[PDB]
Subunit: 253 residues, 4 copies
């Protein structure tokens, strides 16, 4: 209840799923949280539910939305300590030949450039507060995934960008880290499974892909984010895996 | 002289630097090579120098240039076995706050989407020949680099995309691998060093960054590419480091 | 003060350095802690200092010492939730030709087999409590270090063993993770530096090896351990880097 | 036929399996090869079969056997250019609680210390020839394996030791690299499968564990070793994966 007391946190895509889990974890740690989302429904309800959280409508692909997000955060709360770049999307499974350069550009705009833009606008304030950046990447950036060339590329870019920015901001005392979740049960997971011939089988397969035998929860990603913000003062440029062990483990012609 | 006899290889950015080293290595292995470059000077001379290599002017950011590159390769040589996506650029050192979203988009167009576009157009022919893709990424995609947020992000994306496509093309017998060079002495390296206050010191520092005490050569990247194409039949989705050991090795307040 | 209330933790090598930092972090989280060490001086004082911590003399290379450590922990506290395998040593710098197979065997006994033995004896109790194992490995297991072939080998073994055991214990609900610290300012660090021609220069070089510009503290490793035990319920088989960014970042003949 | 002409190579465990594949690849590259094995049957036949290969009985766990192996190599051929540390063993599947410290020590003697001992005795000669070391590790050192805690630990140690020694020998011009194979069809693979309830199912599962849909061949590991010895002059401290993509790719309670 006090690990991050007096601090101000912005969470993008905070209206549902992992983002909402991160919002709740930071509020529970004593922080004030700005919920950014492009959709009003979940984030507005979350603002009413949680004392200490407020909602600001902001599409992270729109530079002027992001400029206003930062200026309103400072105007309302007087400081900025942590930026969690969680907004992102996974398209449905797509064979490589079914992808397009334009679809790839659009996914880069959200998953990569939206993270870049908010971070850039927030860094002057994070320097003043010796704050930190947390990017939500993905395990599949590191190990690959089938039928997801554009998505995987965007997450490889986020993980690498995290390390580069960690180097650049280290002299100024600003840490930059990422979390790479595996299968987390969220509305996006539920939506993608509903597109499949047998959604139930797809979900069962998703649970069994982890040695722990279940999918992860938004709250577990949230606890990892609070650790990185509040207690990981010698960690910068790390990739914190929250995957349940999915990356572990496993005639000649 | 026979390791890759009878095969046809396309090398992007083949007119100088690493690309030219790769062209030479494939010609020396017995292959016919198409040198793709946006600039005529080096590639045209290389075509006159090397029996077995020809030059095609092609800017990999221009989709119609790439369509013609593939169709002319097939028209002239009847098959396509290997695509080496080497074209790319490193901008001068840039602090994060000096970068722009537009500059980042432009670098993604070259370093990431040009690789994506040629690979996509070539894959139908690579499937027919059980051929392979070799992407030239960078060590700094894996470990980061200072004053290079956009560049590092593009190379993290290439390495990750390599793994995704390896998964997708494995059922069809097409391998997809990448090479991550470190400091290789090329005209780009020489150009970036010339921008520095003390170019000589910058170069000395570049040599000393490797345990081997020198920078690498285009020919060494070329030998790695020939290995991946011609002899690495059980390797797919790998990142082959050609870095001289730069990634190895290295009061409390 | 309540994150790990009601839990029982064993920390090997807990009498000074990182181990003592981990002991303090767990006591501060509400746990009861058993301090294991082969030397009485630091651990006995720590027991007098901290309500909630007790000291048991135990050399982790001696199987009967470890059997008694576990049986006394259960006899005194009725449960066991977490085992932190921190005991270990770094020999002075040794050129490869100056090492011996016997010295290598002895270092394996401590850094690898002592971790193995305690974990094995503790696992039946950790299964009953759905507890977890935390091994203290090293960044240099992943990236190498000069003049330390035996040490580096032992830490590569610990990190790999962590992943194997994570797979084996996942069906039983026991998580197994490791922390890989970089330069942490401890009595071992101070002792090794004192062996050098210029200890002050060695220390300055150690601080500058991290982008953060300082060495880490035992308390920071301790916070990472408490996170892994108490809040990382979807993490198993991970390597949590606590290195200050040392692994990030960096004529041809 | 000339890539490694005039060079002298020692391959441990060269009498069958991967080792024999490596022997054949080096003979085919023009080298003279010393086949080391603890068993006479396969290696003696291989010596009769291959002009350019000879067999020396040597158990790599016996220091005096290894001393004689090196001295006889020099006495007979006048130089030593490459040492391939391939001898090793995988025990049958063993649950962690079924392993013993003594069994673990014995496996370390073979898989780790035998590699260490030959490398140490060979390094003075490798320095004279600017030669190189190739260690045969395993993919499972990096990602883990079930029911194999000791084996996985030994291979994590080999991969890490490779990086440490690469750092130490870089000033002297000696490269040190490793190959991490995945499922390679060898007599050890066949022996382990024969211990299983359904050996046929075990083998089918082994083939399907790779995106390429088959196991690898000794010849493919051999080609990777010849590349590392003869053409990878800017590679040191690398881990070359020969795994067919096994490491790629993949309700909340
Ligand atoms: N769910 C998983 O298994 C999983 C695994 C690995 C990584 N991730 C990553 O975690 C993040 C969150 O995923 P999720 O499963 O919670 O997804 P989700 O779709 O359930 O939630 C994403 C939220 O982001 C918002 N958002 C989308 N585009 C936005 C934009 N332009 N501007 C502002 N907000 C925007 C959405 O409205 C939504 O509220 C994403 O980056 C995703 O790539 C998820
Ligand atoms: N030199 C190094 O140290 C180093 C290190 C790691 C990775 N790399 C990568 O290796 C690749 C080659 O680098 P280099 O040092 O040889 O560079 P270079 O600048 O010397 O050569 C690059 C070549 O690509 C061509 N090219 C550029 N844009 C193109 C386009 N749009 N279409 C077609 N051709 C185009 C250029 O005209 C040039 O001939 C790049 O991907 C670079 O990122 C280089
Ligand atoms: N200090 C660093 O920079 C650093 C970096 C990476 C990893 N590590 C690892 O962290 C761990 C702790 O290192 P440290 O710097 O705190 O060392 P330290 O020497 O300051 O403390 C080690 C403690 O372990 C105890 N110990 C040693 N052998 C023992 C045995 N056989 N049985 C029981 N206790 C034993 C010692 O008596 C001592 O109290 C080690 O595993 C080390 O390899 C340290
Ligand atoms: N087969 C695979 O799928 C696989 C996968 C990854 C790694 N590996 C590694 O590859 C290496 C070779 O494996 P393999 O499948 O060919 O095994 P194998 O059992 O078929 O052949 C091993 C050879 O080494 C010899 N050998 C064993 N102990 C020895 C000793 N003390 N001294 C000298 N020679 C000795 C054996 O007599 C045999 O000829 C091992 O290090 C193994 O760990 C194998
Ligand atoms: C939410 N998401 C996901 C999963 C894991 C990650 F690491 C990640 O970043 C995102 C989902 C959700 C449902 C199915 C699939 C999915 C699986 C296999 C191939 C694909 O193309 C997929 F889309 N992926
Ligand atoms: C060619 N290039 C390069 C080097 C290594 C790589 F792995 C890579 O992909 C590219 C260069 C060339 C000269 C100086 C620098 C460079 C160094 C440190 C920060 C920077 O911003 C740099 F630009 N980089
Ligand atoms: C405590 N220790 C250490 C440091 C970093 C680690 F990741 C680690 O596991 C241990 C020390 C302490 C002082 C000097 C050196 C050291 C440095 C370079 C070569 C060597 O051989 C060394 F011994 N290492
Ligand atoms: C030869 N070997 C092997 C396989 C892959 C490697 F990367 C490696 O280093 C060795 C075998 C052969 C047959 C079955 C198994 C095996 C599989 C799953 C759990 C185990 O305990 C096993 F023993 N492993
Ligand atoms: O829709 C799947 C899951 O999404 C998560 O974000 C919510 O917290 C869960 O209540 C829900 O079951
Ligand atoms: O310009 C730096 C270097 O670039 C390389 O691509 C050329 O092969 C060298 O001859 C040249 O010295
Ligand atoms: O000896 C170096 C350092 O060791 C740490 O374990 C102690 O907490 C510090 O007080 C001390 O300065
Ligand atoms: O025993 C399995 C396989 O082992 C390999 O080393 C041999 O080259 C093959 O001929 C054999 O089928
Ligand atoms: Na509120
Ligand atoms: Na020509
Ligand atoms: Na006490
Ligand atoms: Na012979």
């Amino acid at each position: 209840g006090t690990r991050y007391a007096g601090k101000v946190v912005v969470v993008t895509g905070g209206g549902r799923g992992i983002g909402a889990g991160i919002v709740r974890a930071f509020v529970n740690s004593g922080a004030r949280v700005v919920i950014c989302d492009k959709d009003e429904s979940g984030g507005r309800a979350l603002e009413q539910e949680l004392p200490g959280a407020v909602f600001i409508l902001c599409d992270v692909t729109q530079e002027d939305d992001v400029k206003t997000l930062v200026s309103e955060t400072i105007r309302r709360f007087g400081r900025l300590d942590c930026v969690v770049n969680n907004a992102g999307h996974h398209p449905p499974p797509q064979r490589p030949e079914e992808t397009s350069a334009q679809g790839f550009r659009q996914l880069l705009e959200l998953n990569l450039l939206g993270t870049y833009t908010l971070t850039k606008l927030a860094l002057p304030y994070l320097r003043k507060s010796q704050g930190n950046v947390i990017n939500i990447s993905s395990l599949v950036g590191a190990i690959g995934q089938a039928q997801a060339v554009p998505y995987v590329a965007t997450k490889g870019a986020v993980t690498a960008m995290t390390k580069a920015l960690a180097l650049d901001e280290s002299p100024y005392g600003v840490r930059v880290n990422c979390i790479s979740p595996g299968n987390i049960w969220t509305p996006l997971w539920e939506e993608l499974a509903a597109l499949m011939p047998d959604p139930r089988a797809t979900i069962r397969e998703g649970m069994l892909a982890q040695p722990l035998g279940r999918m992860g929860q938004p709250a577990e990603v949230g606890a990892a984010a609070v650790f990185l913000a509040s207690e990981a003062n010698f960690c910068t440029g790390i990739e914190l895996l929250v995957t349940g062990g999915a990356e572990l483990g496993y005639p000649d012609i």
